[PDB]
Design a protein around this ligand. Structure first.
Ligand SMILES: *[C@@H]1O[C@H](CO)[C@@H](O)[C@H](O)[C@H]1NC(C)=O
Ligand SMILES: *[C@@H]1O[C@H](CO)[C@@H](O)[C@H](O)[C@H]1NC(C)=O
Ligand SMILES: *[C@@H]1O[C@H](CO)[C@@H](O)[C@H](O)[C@H]1NC(C)=O
Ligand SMILES: *[C@@H]1O[C@H](CO)[C@@H](O)[C@H](O)[C@H]1NC(C)=O
Ligand SMILES: *[C@@H]1O[C@H](CO)[C@@H](O)[C@H](O)[C@H]1NC(C)=O
Ligand SMILES: *[C@@H]1O[C@H](CO)[C@@H](O)[C@H](O)[C@H]1NC(C)=O
Ligand SMILES: *[C@@H]1O[C@H](CO)[C@@H](O)[C@H](O)[C@H]1NC(C)=O
Ligand SMILES: *[C@@H]1O[C@H](CO)[C@@H](O)[C@H](O)[C@H]1NC(C)=O
Lengths: 163, 322, 322, 163, 322, 163
């Protein structure tokens, strides 16, 4: 979307990552596997859960229509009353439909941002120690075991050790 | 051949779609519907309290005591009231109810009446207090409203009436009374000796003096006469004073307002559903944790907010790739 | 001189500006105006249907048949009605029209009347049905409203009137009638023999009994008398019953409501424009594909939505660099 | 703007690119020339056209005022009626003026995003085969003919072939 | 060891928090409160102009001249009017004020009256123009409203009244008058010789004919009689015509409308505060440069816009890091 | 936030930079020190000041309630009048509370964007002349005196001179 990661330079999503929303796919001599990044996954759950509740709570104090009756010589205020209740219903229907459209868009771009920030978190740790293929992957120059992959996910990758 | 690590994101078998400003039908991994679109099609109890279903009677017919509405002679407390669009049993004897819509607005803040006697038939010594009409049949025999009395002359005489009721109850009191408008001077004297008559009514705030209008009118329920009814709220310790020399449809019963609270008069053809609900509409009841619904704008109870939308769905997950 | 490829974006000679929250007058390559700001200054036909332009007449003056409004004695169907702010030709003979605003609200849902005779002048044998006044001049000679009759005594007598009209048409029927309020008892007896008079009117739903108010009043159109007019809708198969012994401005003509639909009464000083439009306002007509406009809030037809904005412009292109 | 491309590291726009909204300027032995990127140009046209229509369609069910009349003893409800109609007109005027201001801002940043995503689409294809000048251009180490430039625009640039 | 340059941003000791959609209590470096939440608790002058504080009097009691309201016999111009919820001194002699709420709506557009005499007591030759009652005591002795006169019979006679006032002022004129409703026919003849009476009132737009309603009513202020009052605006060069043969509470004083503008009737128990303000509410005055406030929805003056929010705070700075 | 700079790859803010909102921390043989970037700081002040005023000015034409009175047989229109005034107050309260929530979010991401655009302004000037540590800093290969640091802040860093 706006940040170019989801359906961008990362061509598609992973069926195999059932663990969270964003994460890694490693492969080395030991074996390959998926592992969700629990930090940015949890960050997003919180952000999105709050958005949802904020949308529900903002619409609490809303217009509520009421039955009123009028006789056949009160047609002007009958009509006035109708116009006023439709009026408020139409304002609130618009406020709901638009809020959803606007925040849906923000939510999708928010996920796009989180994926891009994760790619850049890895990119800034590796630097010369890995080749940026550009499809979402990094080709290691040195060998990287399961201890070494764990450090990348931790955010504790020692660059001076491997160069 | 060399080791590598990739960055990616979730995908799944979801086909749930949402909309944005620039893009429609966007498939996502997770979405949340926030709009309730279904109802049970029934009129239920509102949180354990049964509604008042008037069936074929109107609020007027109920309160005045049309004989067809004998079902509602002493109704228990209610949560809401349900009236049909055009109830069959209204004012059996034709004529209007004065300030009817304002009376109905009062019912919206009332949950229970307690009907009581304020002027017994037995106290009408000098007048015949047993007037009836074939416009109000009860089992083929002519009859009349239960809660008001049609006074007529006795012994070719209609002496001036002078009656007071003092509201010695603690509750506000709904009092109803009426005036009869006859066809011609013949019927005027035949029912009430006096040819020129009046009804005066007075409380601490009311100051009324009604005069009958004698005129030829189109037959309604086989009657060219009309009856016009009035009402008032009589405060505790206040008293109502009636004076009349003819045409007086006097009160027999009044209503103590014993319980006030949230209520409403729904117009609905539906009958009682034998269910319970937290939220009710005129076309059905809603059981839902959704924050919005689109069933009907008029609701009572703990309800979701009404919108005219056909669909409201929030994206929670990622754009889902095929 | 090695080969190279650059990434860039569009620029052009555009000076179109748009606004954002953080920034004003932002020049862009492409923009779209979405606000219509002009109108033709004319009252047009609405989708081929000409409006009813009352010119110097009022709705009252038209319907009662003020002689100055003879132009509108049988008007063809209309799309909307245009009345001036203070029309010259209202009730020529002074006095009020009862429930006038509610009658005008009915016109908003009516597109065509068909005026018919319901009580011919020739049927007034015992009364003079040719009363006129210099307050309603038609070509210098004194005259009166065309659609109602001023009945006065004949042969120093005003016998009680008893007339019925039964609506045997299929359409609803607008009936108008009136009561005359004189200056003093002298003029009362001089016009109608009887000193104490009444007018009773009855339908299936109407029950009226009017009594004239004799009093001295400021001269209006050289008259201290007043005329108060009334109206009703007479349903098919219902009948109206008049009874009176004086002061009765009786109906001659009534109006069949033959076409109902969308309409409105615009207040406007403008005259007919001889154009056609899909959207009309009181100050002019709009021909526009814009979704918004700011011409006037009161419109009729297929119109854009009205806003009070002076400018609404959407960016579609890029920020344009100088 | 927000994404730093338009009026950022790409210093200005190109008068010469009349073909579309974003694109390329090549130069080699054969000849130079402009060519719009039809993918991201078309993507933007669709996005922006939809936005416009969504803004128009959301305001469909809106308040419509109506002439009502009152006599001189109905001043309270005359006034009430006036306040209610001005009320709704003011609410809707605000809803229009604000929607435009908010979406104009998003639209300009959307273009900024598309230009940046195009720069990164090229950058990730070339890598070591070209020098990132930083003004929006890439200086080729190897020679690149019109067949070779076409591959960059296609998204079919073979990196292993030239290194 | 080697040289280096870093890019960073501001942080400080701020604990100011703001909210977004996805996140609450977000600490920022700088924020701006835009909601005024306090008031001075006083009723002040509005931009140098003192309000009219009626204290224990009502608008009716003031305008008719209840003797308890002698404080307000000629009040200077005002900015707004402050009336208590249930003022003690209303209509001392019981009864209603006709179209009272519509009169009060007029006061909202009025800043100053100038009271003048239009019918002096000395002009009542044939009637006693000195009627009083113990329901309106002024210092223990019985009295009456100051601005209207209670006419009664003189020498066992009540000849028909016929009086005109022509508004030869340049300003619109508020005229008030009344009718007395007695208990029984005994009191009717005892006060006004005639048993059957009327009051007719006429302007260019008014055409009224009041008849007293004789009836027994609950004692209010020790009185079973009622007085019903009426009002009108008399345009310049128009005249009002009174005719009556009994029960007429005639005008003595009327009010010239000399200043029109913004005003309002606040309901408040508060007393005058001896302050000045640019914005006033019924519970206090606001001095604030904030664009919003949440004090009270009814305000007068140059005021911030009212919201029901408890907190409105805009982020201006960066997210502040611990 | 959305752009990954503030509380992202730049781990925290600086107490010592009291000069502006964004800037630099240099260190060389001469001495270290903070200096705000006056261009992007001023750009942000203008943007944010305008936002604030736009929020205030948009709410100018708003609903204003008025005292009306009704007698005890005008309960339907009394109630109607009440529902209409609460109605408009609730619509406007929602419009205020929501505008603030939406623009607060945008403002924080706007700062995040400005910091990231400043990092990229430096990054694109240095290129191979400095090592991108990834914590927000650049390690110089060549020595850089106070004249040389000033050029980076100016935007007048001569890359050909030092390579
Ligand atoms: C995929 O969807 C199927 C239905 O098509 C569902 O039953 C299954 O649980 C889904 N997979 C999950 C939740 O992992
Ligand atoms: C998808 O959206 C289109 C309009 O873009 C609509 O017509 C359709 O009903 C939507 N849903 C479907 C096809 O299930
Ligand atoms: C009704 O009764 C109470 C107390 O018994 C009395 O004080 C009151 O005056 C009576 N009300 C009237 C209107 O006479
Ligand atoms: C911009 O260029 C167009 C050519 O398409 C021309 O019509 C127009 O006049 C130009 N505007 C100005 C201000 O020169
Ligand atoms: C540009 O906007 C300014 C206010 O920001 C306004 O005064 C001016 O008239 C606008 N248009 C111009 C300069 O053409
Ligand atoms: C009017 O005419 C119809 C047709 O004969 C008749 O059936 C009906 O009774 C009449 N209406 C009234 C009110 O008498
Ligand atoms: C922050 O918000 C919480 C509710 O989530 C509230 O209880 C608390 O008082 C707020 N923090 C303050 C006032 O410092
Ligand atoms: C009242 O007096 C004015 C002159 O002061 C006169 O022109 C006008 O006609 C009079 N009004 C009436 C209603 O007679």
């Amino acid at each position: 979307g706006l940040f170019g990661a989801i359906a961008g330079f990362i061509e598609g999503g992973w069926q195999g990552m059932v663990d969270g929303w964003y994460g890694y796919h490693h492969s080395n001599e030991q074996g390959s596997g998926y592992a969700a990044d629990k930090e940015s996954t949890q960050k997003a759950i919180d952000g999105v859960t709050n958005k949802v509740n904020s949308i529900i709570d903002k619409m609490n104090t809303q217009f509520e229509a009421v039955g009123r009756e009028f006789n056949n010589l009160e047609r002007r205020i009958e009509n006035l009353n109708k116009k006023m209740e439709d009026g408020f219903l139409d304002v609130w229907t618009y406020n709901a439909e638009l809020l959803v459209l606007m925040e849906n868009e923000r939510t999708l771009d928010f996920h796009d941002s989180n994926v891009k920030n994760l790619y850049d978190k890895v990119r800034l740790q590796l630097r010369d120690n890995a080749k940026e293929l550009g499809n979402g992957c990094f080709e290691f120059y040195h060998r990287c075991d399961n201890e070494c992959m764990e450090s990348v996910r931790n955010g504790t990758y020692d660059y001076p050790q491997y160069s | 051949d060399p080791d590598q690590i990739c960055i990616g994101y979730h995908a799944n078998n979801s086909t749930e779609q949402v909309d944005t400003i620039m893009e429609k039908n966007v498939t996502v991994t997770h979405a949340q519907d926030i709009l309730e679109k279904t109802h049970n099609g029934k009129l239920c109890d509102l949180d354990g309290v049964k509604p008042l279903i008037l069936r074929d009677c109107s609020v007027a017919g109920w309160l005045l005591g049309n004989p067809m509405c004998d079902e509602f002679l002493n109704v228990p407390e209610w949560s809401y009231i349900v009236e049909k669009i055009n109830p069959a049993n209204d004012l059996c004897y034709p004529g209007n109810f004065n300030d009817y819509e304002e009376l109905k607005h009062l019912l919206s803040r009332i949950n229970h009446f307690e009907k009581i006697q304020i002027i017994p038939k037995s106290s009408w010594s000098d007048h015949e207090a047993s007037g009836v009409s074939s416009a109000c049949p009860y089992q083929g025999r002519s009859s009349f409203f239960r809660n008001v009395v049609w006074l007529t002359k006795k012994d070719n005489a209609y002496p001036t009436i002078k009656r007071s009721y003092n509201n010695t109850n603690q509750e506000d009191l709904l009092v109803l009374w009426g005036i009869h408008h006859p066809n011609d001077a013949a019927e005027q004297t035949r029912l009430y000796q006096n040819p020129t008559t009046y009804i005066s009514v007075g409380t601490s705030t009311l100051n009324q003096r009604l005069v009958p209008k004698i005129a030829t009118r189109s037959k309604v329920n086989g009657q060219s006469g009309r009856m016009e009814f009035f009402w008032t709220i009589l405060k505790p310790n206040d008293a109502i004073n009636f004076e009349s020399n003819g045409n007086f449809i006097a009160p027999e019963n009044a209503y103590k307002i014993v319980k006030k609270g949230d209520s409403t008069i729904m117009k609905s053809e539906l009958e009682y559903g034998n269910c319970n609900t937290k939220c009710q509409t005129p076309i059905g009841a809603i059981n839902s944790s959704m924050p919005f619904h689109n069933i009907h704008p008029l609701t009572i109870g703990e309800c979701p907010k009404y919108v005219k939308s056909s669909r409201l769905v929030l994206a929670t997950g990622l754009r889902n790739s095929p």
